[PDB]
Design a protein around this nucleic acid. Structure first.
Length: 180
RNA sequence: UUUGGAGAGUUUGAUCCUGGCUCAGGACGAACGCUGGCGGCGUGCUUAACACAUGCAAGUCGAACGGAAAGGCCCUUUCGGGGG
């Protein structure tokens, strides 16, 4: 059930003795819709083969996204070559609101509620890399408290833990109709 | 202890970056074009502090005053009017 999302298709041109020898590049994000996401860049003579290579590269380099509900743990500004993407968590119902690249990677990760904004290098590839760098900079409170050597309560805020418990209930207790 | 940022196109054979230009949105004391049924609530010289016909826009008090021109009342009466 992996959700896949192409963001950009570009006809690139090598030049040779005869002339322009073309190919196609597909930027394909794929995700589980629940927090695992991967990015791929497929380069191939034909568009569908490019997309397939992108899918394969993505499913190879999947990575897991920290979440507290259907948003992210904390705000974070990821940088790439020159893509700069701030991410800011958001209350539920405001909706993932972002440009098509950040939007695609977030929607494939399953982040339905988030604030995002590209601040440099409108190019979708570097934007996606910047967004991914942000998501990799993300830090779940459990591993944070481990990193500190403390409880979770005295490093994380009560609002985050409230939403955490709420989401955990709505996951487990509401998985009853799926498990039975 | 609550909150709220979307991008796209365009330099190149193609790429990335920078960088500008443009667009998508919202608003208006608005104007124009096409069109036009109803109501409600508002709103209307943003320019010539340019010139202005005309009519109204600051009067009131007779319990401040002399008074009595118009009405009123009463005497008068040639019914013309005259007095208080």
């Amino acid at each position: 059930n992996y959700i896949e999302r192409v963001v950009s298709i570009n006809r690139v041109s090598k030049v040779v003795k005869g002339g322009r020898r073309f190919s196609f590049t597909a930027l394909v994000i794929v995700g589980d819709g629940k927090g695992m996401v991967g990015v791929g860049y497929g380069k191939a003579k034909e568009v569908p083969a490019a997309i397939a290579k992108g899918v394969e590269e993505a499913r190879k380099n999947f990575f897991r996204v920290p979440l507290i509900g259907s948003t992210i743990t904390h705000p974070v500004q990821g940088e790439a070559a020159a893509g700069v993407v701030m991410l800011r968590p958001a209350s539920p119902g405001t909706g993932v609101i972002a440009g098509g690249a950040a939007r695609a990677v977030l929607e494939c990760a399953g982040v339905h509620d988030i604030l995002a904004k590209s601040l440099g290098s409108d190019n979708a590839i570097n934007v996606v890399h910047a967004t991914v760098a942000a998501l990799k900079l993300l830090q779940r409170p459990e591993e944070v408290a481990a990193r500190r050597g403390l409880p979770i309560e005295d490093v994380a805020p009560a609002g985050m833990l409230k939403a955490r418990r709420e989401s955990e209930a709505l996951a487990a207790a509401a998985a009853r109709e799926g498990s039975a």
